[PDB]
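Budget justification note: compute hours in this period were largely spent on complex prediction jobs such as the one shown. Inputs:
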Amino acid sequence: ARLVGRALELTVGFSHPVVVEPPEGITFEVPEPTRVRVSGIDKQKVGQVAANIRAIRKPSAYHEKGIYYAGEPVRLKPGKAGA
Amino acid sequence: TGADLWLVIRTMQERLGARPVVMQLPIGREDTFSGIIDVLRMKAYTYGNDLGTDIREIPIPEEYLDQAREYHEKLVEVAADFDENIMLKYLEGEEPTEEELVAAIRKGTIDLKITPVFLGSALKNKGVQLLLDAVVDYLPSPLDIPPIKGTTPEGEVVEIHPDPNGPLAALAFKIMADPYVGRLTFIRVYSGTLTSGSYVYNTTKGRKERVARLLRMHANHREEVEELKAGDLGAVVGLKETITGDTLVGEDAPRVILESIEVPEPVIDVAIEPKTKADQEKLSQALARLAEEDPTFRVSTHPETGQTIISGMGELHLEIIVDRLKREFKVDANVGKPQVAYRETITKPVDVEGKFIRQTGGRGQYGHVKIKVEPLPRGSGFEFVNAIVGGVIPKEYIPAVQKGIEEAMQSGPLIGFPVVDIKVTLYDGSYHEVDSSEMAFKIAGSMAIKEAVQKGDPVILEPIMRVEVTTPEEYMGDVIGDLNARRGQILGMEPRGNAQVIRAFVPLAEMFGYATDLRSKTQGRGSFVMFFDHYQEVPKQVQEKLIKG
Amino acid sequence: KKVVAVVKLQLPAGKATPAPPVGPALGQHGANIMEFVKAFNAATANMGDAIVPVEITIYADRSFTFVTKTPPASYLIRKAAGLEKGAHKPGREKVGRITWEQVLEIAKQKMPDLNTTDLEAAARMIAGSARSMGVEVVGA
Amino acid sequence: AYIPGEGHNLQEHSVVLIRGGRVKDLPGVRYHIVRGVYDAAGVKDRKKSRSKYGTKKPKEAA
Amino acid sequence: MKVRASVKRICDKCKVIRRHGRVYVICENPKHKQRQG
RNA sequence: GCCAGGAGGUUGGCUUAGAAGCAGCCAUCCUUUAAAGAGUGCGUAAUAGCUCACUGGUCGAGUGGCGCCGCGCCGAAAAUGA
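Corresponding output:
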């Protein structure tokens, strides 16, 4: 997860970089690439963008890998369960 | 992305128990690669590009240095578990002479002690010449490879010396095809010199062999050599008999033999039924050049069903075998499921009347046999008793009336297969001087048995194997799951060493090609052994569903 | 190096193997459990067996220490009330019978174990656990 | 194709060496087998007809 | 389950939540994911 | 709601390859306690663990359960255009 100028250029399981842009009323801010930070000055439109990115790259995908708020992943059998 | 160090390292002593001393460290993780440092000779060979047209070796770019330094220390420190100089030298804090590294380290290396981790990247030609140098420095010469084991022309031990004056004595491996020099045998001799244009002799199945031209696959073009030395390697022409693993001495050369007894034990069992049995023997010729170019597999027919079975040690292995078939051999064979030998029995005491009241044109051959029939455990065996209620049936039926008990017990009443693991008995009969032959009461026995087994509580004793799951605890729980889901039941869990092995009941009908299954549930932690036990019933519904025609 | 790891288990007297999870707990220990096997079997020479609790440990420089405990009350009732494997199901069948002394030793032996390190509760306590295993009682 | 007698394996290939000679047995007995060939190699322990019945030179090594 | 006229609270960790008009039965495991339809 | 005790005989006995509160039959305790069950659910190869139960710390005002009746709501798809 990078942050060039104004936009955030994170790079997930997608075949291309994910390009977000802090809109009016709230600010993001990416300290280190492993975890994005978002100073949200609008509790409502805030979680909407939290969910924006979480649903941009959904985590847990059977085993792991993705974008977690911090919500403890529920598993499911990896290299198995497909006869 | 994912190219690392501690990764590999950790994985080594955590998946076997090695001792991964390494000797080179990267300059830039993923994409950002530019070369390597060498904690061995204390140098930093760096490749300024991928293709490797213009490389270099400047010192540490500034940030590394100290890093690799501790690992350099590690090197010498570890070398303390060998000689005496190095250990005491680290005690002194003295500098290792650049070649005692080559010593103590090649020492441990070839001694199977340390794990000279040299590394790099292929496509971006980097981390190469360091490990070529590391080959020429730490990779073992035949001088260091211990006395190779084997047998004599008599029977004992052997000593295969590197002696390039020693008795011609060789091994060979691969059976190559070729247009010009045809049958090509890829060989590594061992002990004994061999000329270009001389003779030899197979030291296995005995055959005087003509050696035409010794050869060396020199990367691009192949290079014809005057001789093969004792320890050197190469491929020869001719040898119109030499298969694989054959021990090959000269025409004389104390006719010595090599040990090397390996095993491609069976793990796969897939059936194959060509359309008409005309395509079949035709494909016995197919196999005739399939089982004679690739050892491995076993082409064994079943007894209690026809159809030759292809057994072997690989899923995809057997499959691309079948591909090669449907490629350059074009067979029409709807690759069948392996069939089963089905025995059978009963569970009740039936009294019946095997009365043969038939007076043909005078001779009859009439046989009134009164038998009691008793059933006992599946695994017992076949019984019968010399049971005459007083003195009825003649003593010439005794070993021939029971025949018709045996005879009519090869063909069961249901679908019909050998009814085994039963007692029997008898008790009375009726006898007449002329109106009776041996086979008369044999067939009285036939009638008796057919009625007493049709009306006797039918059942089907399908076979069930024991199987030793050779695998650790994780995938052990997993596979115990699978095996329960395979109709049978386990019954064995003895905690082994690097594994924990589970002795398991599994029903031969199920457990079909279980390796393919297993080789997944454990990813790859070994497997099992075919340890056949005995047979029991198929839970009602499977018995009638099979009643076909 | 591995600093202080005290791991205690439930190894019965007769099994001379480091079978898991004795491995992945006392391997990070360098366990002389082999010494636990040949110094605890003889410690209880009066029978040399029965299921006994243990406690083993490591002190940095690979230092072990086994700590043994007492037999269990369902085995220590099978030996007493003349049970073979048991009186098959606690709500139907009964073998022997517990009176006013066999119970006494059932509690006496296992004085420093049960729950209450006191006598005037233990007796009746396991005398009820008796009915849990299926052994009748003579009452006087 | 018959066989040179006791001590068998032969299963299904063997390269049974078509040979020659009928008798009052099997309406054929023609073109016998050899033992040795690609398979069989004679009786497990034979002391005479080793000229087809396989066994090399009974060296009891004593 | 998942969409059927007979929606239950099954494993007590499920709730009836009259959302967007009609009944669903939500929990943790989406396997219990009924609906009044 | 939140913090925390959440125990000991024990792995109840019966089974069973094992059935350890926990796949199943009987059961149908007793004790250390303020309170902790022969256990509610997840989980395990069975243990482990998670867990409810129960009881105090906090807390400060109402809650938990069952039945009935009136109107609804899901149940509720078909052919030219309503």
